[PDB]
Design an enzyme around this catalytic site. Structure first.
Site, PDB file in Angstrom:
ATOM      1  N   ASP A 131      43.932  38.703  37.330  1.00  0.00           N
ATOM      2  CA  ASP A 131      42.976  38.648  38.443  1.00  0.00           C
ATOM      3  C   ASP A 131      43.143  39.818  39.407  1.00  0.00           C
ATOM      4  OD1 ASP A 131      41.932  36.234  37.457  1.00  0.00           O
ATOM      5  OD2 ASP A 131      43.288  35.006  38.665  1.00  0.00           O
ATOM      6  N   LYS A 133      42.382  42.724  41.682  1.00  0.00           N
ATOM      7  CA  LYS A 133      41.184  43.151  42.413  1.00  0.00           C
ATOM      8  C   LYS A 133      41.571  43.734  43.783  1.00  0.00           C
ATOM      9  CE  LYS A 133      40.264  38.321  43.785  1.00  0.00           C
ATOM     10  NZ  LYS A 133      41.545  37.873  43.172  1.00  0.00           N
ATOM     11  N   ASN A 136      43.760  41.955  46.310  1.00  0.00           N
ATOM     12  CA  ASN A 136      45.163  41.778  45.921  1.00  0.00           C
ATOM     13  C   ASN A 136      46.002  43.053  46.108  1.00  0.00           C
ATOM     14  OD1 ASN A 136      45.286  38.986  45.120  1.00  0.00           O
ATOM     15  ND2 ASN A 136      44.257  39.502  43.202  1.00  0.00           N
ATOM     16  N   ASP A 152      50.141  38.260  44.146  1.00  0.00           N
ATOM     17  CA  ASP A 152      49.765  37.216  43.187  1.00  0.00           C
ATOM     18  C   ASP A 152      50.039  37.547  41.710  1.00  0.00           C
ATOM     19  OD1 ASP A 152      49.019  35.658  45.357  1.00  0.00           O
ATOM     20  OD2 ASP A 152      46.865  35.705  44.912  1.00  0.00           O
ATOM     21  N   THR A 171      35.414  38.441  42.152  1.00  0.00           N
ATOM     22  CA  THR A 171      36.200  38.316  40.918  1.00  0.00           C
ATOM     23  C   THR A 171      35.502  38.836  39.653  1.00  0.00           C
ATOM     24  OG1 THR A 171      35.513  36.009  40.590  1.00  0.00           O
ATOM     25  CG2 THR A 171      37.540  36.396  41.831  1.00  0.00           C
TER      26      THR A 171
END
Ligand SMILES: Nc1ncnc2c1cnn2CC1CCNCC1
Length: 458
Positions: A131, A133, A136, A152, A171
């Site tokens: 995930d 992106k 993050n 994360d 996302t």
């Protein structure tokens, strides 16, 4: 059998991340500040068993790299997981980049070298992100020399992602096609990094569309182009790396470690400013953040409808005498009873947090805290402190999106915003027509607030 609240107290809310709220906390003995992510078991399901989660946490606590968030402690109780790690204060990468006068391939290369460096390290340890992106990617501090910290890493393997749109903004742009179909490996992180690099140099997502599913259809087909005007500013080697990272078949896609050795990384981290890319990233960012704020506002209005009536019924039941009068301890007991039934508020970690919140509401209402209080008046105030808070977040995001200070959002802009928010096209137009009865083809802030209330059943 160690308890989170025995060790840490909450100072303030840091914001919303994937899987839960992040609270700035402080160790009650050492004074150490930490960013604590609080994951609700009711809201988020686990993908793996107890044993697999503990072993992964145990590994993650030992890992150390300058471009990877440092994890310190893990706790668990009947309703929550607590991921305790290092605080970073620089904010999101993209918010720092839109505040610059200039931005070149040298700047982009230094950013991507950091991200690739962190990814390479975690891949060596068999940890995949999936995930990855822009949200993050946090800068370690406010210093202009600040390192990027990826957050994360490794979490998505153990927790199931939200299906709710308020948790999914952004996302679709960054997810690798193989993650959509089920067979994926560490190469999915190189794809997401490629998307991020495409956006750093052009300011537009390579895979885009009028709504989430249209974006996903584009990602799945995997076709993109370098035909926009702003790509003519860019070196062929930057576009060559991007091609290698956005290669469809993962076995043929470049690895993170080999991407570090690419000619573009080697040359530009050892040139003209990209003015048009900065312009597009600022617009992209403003658009993404207003859709988020819109969805969060709609959510907090629903949460309020729920909590107001619940709290009134808890106190009515508590008011055995039936005269509407309760004391501070009874108000605290009832507010804690609301937290047990709901478990929505991450910042009410323990009994001592709720006592402070009751006192804040009492000090606002101008009623004495040592006598008996009218509970209906307390309920109105306590809920408005969450209602008005979310109301101001939305407005700030409206002002930021309205970069021309016109006071208005056009109908074309509403389509873009509601497209990112995944509000059905026919549905918002209906709500617009109900409020825009002068055919202005545009709305000011209050009219926009009114639409959102109408789009959450009010
Ligand atoms: N380690 C952290 N330090 C400071 N804030 C943090 C974290 C982890 N998550 N968060 C919350 C922010 C909230 C704004 N979006 C990016 C993440």
């Amino acid at each position: 059998t160690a308890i989170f609240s025995d060790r840490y107290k909450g100072q303030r809310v840091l914001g919303k991340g994937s899987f839960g709220e992040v609270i700035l906390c402080k160790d009650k003995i050492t004074g150490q500040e930490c960013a604590v992510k609080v994951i609700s078991k009711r809201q988020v399901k686990q993908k793996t068993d107890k044993e697999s989660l503990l072993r992964e946490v145990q590994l993650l606590k030992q890992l150390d790299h300058p471009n990877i968030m440092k994890l310190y402690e893990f706790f668990e109780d009947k309703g929550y997981f607590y991921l305790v790690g290092e605080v970073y204060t620089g904010g999101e990468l993209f918010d720092e980049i839109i505040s610059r006068k200039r931005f070149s391939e040298v700047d982009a290369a230094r950013i991507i070298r950091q991200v690739l460096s962190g990814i390479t390290y975690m891949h060596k340890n068999k940890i995949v992100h999936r995930d990855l992106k822009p949200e993050n990617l946090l800068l370690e501090s406010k210093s202009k020399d600040a390192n990027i910290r990826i957050i994360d890493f490794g979490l998505s393997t153990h927790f199931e992602a939200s299906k709710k749109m308020k948790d999914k903004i952004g996302t679709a742009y960054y997810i690798a096609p193989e993650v959509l179909h089920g067979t994926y490996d560490e190469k999915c992180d190189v794809w997401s990094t490629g998307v991020i690099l495409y956006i750093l140099l052009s300011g537009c997502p390579p895979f885009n569309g009028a709504n989430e599913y249209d974006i996903l259809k584009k990602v799945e087909k995997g076709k993109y182009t370098f035909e926009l005007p702003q790509w003519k500013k860019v070196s062929e080697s930057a576009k060559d790396l991007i091609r290698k990272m956005l290669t469809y078949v993962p076995s043929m896609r470049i690895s993170a470690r080999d991407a570090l050795d690419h000619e573009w990384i080697q040359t530009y981290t050892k040139v003209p400013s990209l003015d048009n890319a900065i312009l597009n990233i600022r617009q992209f960012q403003g658009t993404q953040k207003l859709a988020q704020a819109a969805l969060l506002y709609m959510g907090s209005k629903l949460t309020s409808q729920d909590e107001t009536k619940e709290l009134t019924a808890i106190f009515h039941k508590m008011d055995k005498n039936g005269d509407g009068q309760l004391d501070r301890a009874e108000l605290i007991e009832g507010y804690k009873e609301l937290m047990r039934m709901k478990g929505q508020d991450a910042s009410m970690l323990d009994a001592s947090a709720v006592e402070h919140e009751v006192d804040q509401v009492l000090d606002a209402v101008d009623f004495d805290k040592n006598g008996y209080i009218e509970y209906s008046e307390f309920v109105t105030v306590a809920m408005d402190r969450k209602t008005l808070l979310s109301r101001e977040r939305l407005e700030r995001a409206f002002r930021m999106f309205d970069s021309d200070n016109s006071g208005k959002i056009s109908s074309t802009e509403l389509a873009t915003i509601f497209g990112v928010s995944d509000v059905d096209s026919e549905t918002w137009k209906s709500v617009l027509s109900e409020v825009d009865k002068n055919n202005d083809g545009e709305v000011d802030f209050d009219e926009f607030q009114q639409m959102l209330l109408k789009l959450c059943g009010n």
